[PDB]
């Protein structure tokens, strides 16, 4: 493998662009300085390898100072191309990404653990023939929410501080009630309207510690009615929401629902199923 340049962060550790120097393919490749999360990371894609919008692993093993995890060379995040399509996704766009990300997080979900970092830049499109398929990425703060065996849902826990990004936390994240399914999928929702609006009310809020602003994201998301967040948009959002928010600590999300509501809101808007993402029209 020839080593490349650094293009990114995750949850822990840097990721590099780097070749499959025999088979002259580019590959993506994340490093982890030899508290090591890294193949832990790597035992969970392993696990959920064979699964649909799930990145491959190619290699994985120790070199000089640094762990690493060769995987599959991916096209860009949503965040990217949200940038890319001037930081605002057409109905139609949002709505072909709901019914594949609901289907990720549903997925991860059917393997025994939950993401906790839903977010645009978690999810990347595909390349070649899955140039249409939305991955998802990063497993560094994920956790098993059931065990494996008998499905004993993980314990209801309070006091936890913050894991994963502000922005797109769910309101009970921020609470500090330990994270389950429903919290990826509200996560989601926010996403979704992030996508919708080009923004969200409690982005750019100014502080000071670094920790108080994660209380004023907190006061803001909870000042924020559901119906005031997505005025103006598809009454399934704001549905959608309201569905996240009604879910017990350790209810099955009802995902096919969440697809439905999305998919009727597609059929009835009139949109053509040929899968044209906004991006896919840069000329
Ligand atoms: C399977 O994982 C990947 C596969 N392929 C790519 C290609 O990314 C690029 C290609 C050309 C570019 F110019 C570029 F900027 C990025 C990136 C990843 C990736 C993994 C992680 C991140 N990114 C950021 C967050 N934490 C991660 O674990």
New binding site residues.
Partial sequence: YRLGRK?????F?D?Y?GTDIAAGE???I?LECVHPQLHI?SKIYKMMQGGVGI?TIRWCGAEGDYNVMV???????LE?LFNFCSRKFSLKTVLLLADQMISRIEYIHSKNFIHRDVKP??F?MGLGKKGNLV?I????LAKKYRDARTHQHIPYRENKNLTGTARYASINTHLGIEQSRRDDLESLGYVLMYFNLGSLPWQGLKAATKRQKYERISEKKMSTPIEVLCKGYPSEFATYLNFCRSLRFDDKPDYSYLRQLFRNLFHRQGFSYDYVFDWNMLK
Avoid: R, T
Avoid at 7 to 11: A, L, R
């Fill in positions: 293009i990114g962060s995750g949850s550790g990721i662009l580019e590959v993506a994340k990371e990145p995987m599959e060379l991916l096209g860009p995040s990217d830049d978690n990347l991955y990425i990063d497993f560094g």
